Amino acid sequence: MNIFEMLRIDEGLRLKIYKDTEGYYTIGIGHLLTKSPSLNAAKSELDKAIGRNCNGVITKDEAEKLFNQDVDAAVRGILRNAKLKPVYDSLDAVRRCALINMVFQMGETGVAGFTNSLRMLQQKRWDEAAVNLAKSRWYNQTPNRAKRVITTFRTGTWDAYK
């Protein structure tokens, strides 16, 4: 029971392309296609990502596959960062999937942007690390999801997702 069996809890699951809560166009679980107003750009980037003219619908196995391609993009992506790697080491794997949720969500740069919270995580001052993951580009964006993930750091378990 881990990241897949986390984000799938985090974002629901539609085979169809759809708007995210921030209004960026999206298909699958958290898989941004384009920020562009044109949906066709989303369908086209989807056309490259899937290798076929999906036109907003895909076989569920392709959804699982693209979902794996994105989670794998998160896993050659967290490692390159100078800051995230020691923190990814300090986390229990149950929190490591949470860091994967972070880098998958706000992007690697924003997860890089919470340097103090991460410093508290590697030092395992989990409480203030949580209070600092709480002073907001992420926590303000998805406050319930961010609460679930920060709780995931607080607990060492999936309990926020209950």
TrEMBL record:
Q: Does the keyword Hydrolase apply?
A: yes
Q: Which taxonomic lineage does the organism of this UniProt entry have?
A: Viruses, Duplodnaviria, Heunggongvirae, Uroviricota, Caudoviricetes
Taken from the record, one Pfam family name reads: Phage_lysozyme
Gene3D superfamilies hit by this protein? 1.10.530.40
In Swiss-Prot or TrEMBL terms, this protein is called Endolysin
Q: Which organism is it from?
A: Enterobacteria phage RB59
CDD domains, per the entry = T4-like_lys
Enzyme Commission code(s) on record: 3.2.1.17
What reaction does this catalyse?
Hydrolysis of (1->4)-beta-linkages between N-acetylmuramic acid and N-acetyl-D-glucosamine residues in a peptidoglycan and between N-acetyl-D-glucosamine residues in chitodextrins
